[PDB]
Amino acid sequence: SMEQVAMELRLTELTRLLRSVLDQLQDKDPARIFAQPVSLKEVPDYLDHIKHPMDFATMRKRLEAQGYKNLHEFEEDFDLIIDNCMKYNARDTVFYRAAVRLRDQGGVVLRQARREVDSIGLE
């Protein structure tokens, strides 16, 4: 149907915007600490601690499959990256501190993303 195609175009539009947002957020992780999933070979107990692992590569895979229906779902996954890190790692670590900086700098980006999604009406 035509209505279905129009909804699909809206999803494609949202995906384009979120790709730009994802690129901007990942730029705030210059150390690439959050670029890839935590390795279960190198951290074998990780899933005993963290029940829903997340990372930028995994978000990008979901994004390119148009798997985020709205900004809230995208933000959920970004918050997992930060929140998982701040639980597993202690405050005095480069990992925790990178997550704080990513959260703070990312908030700026997500503030304007929300306005743009509302403004152009993408969800």
Swiss-Prot record:
Subcellular location: Nucleus; Chromosome
Tissue expression: Highly expressed in testis.
Coiled-coil regions, chain positions: none
Location of cross-link Glycyl lysine isopeptide (Lys-Gly) (interchain with G-Cter in SUMO2): K41
Domain Bromo stretches: 9-113
UniProt function note: Scaffold subunit of various histone acetyltransferase (HAT) complexes, such as the MOZ/MORF and HBO1 complexes, that acts as a regulator of hematopoiesis. Plays a key role in HBO1 complex by directing KAT7/HBO1 specificity towards histone H3 'Lys-14' acetylation (H3K14ac), thereby promoting erythroid differentiation.
Subunit structure: Component of some HBO1 complex composed of KAT7/HBO1, MEAF6, ING4 and BRD1/BRPF2. Component of the MOZ/MORF complex composed at least of ING5, KAT6A, KAT6B, MEAF6 and one of BRPF1, BRD1/BRPF2 and BRPF3. Interacts (via PHD-type zinc finger domain) with unmodified histone H3. Interacts (via PWWP domain) with dimethylated and trimethylated 'Lys-79' on histone H3.
This protein's name: Bromodomain-containing protein 1
Organism the protein comes from: Homo sapiens (Human)
Gene designation: BRD1
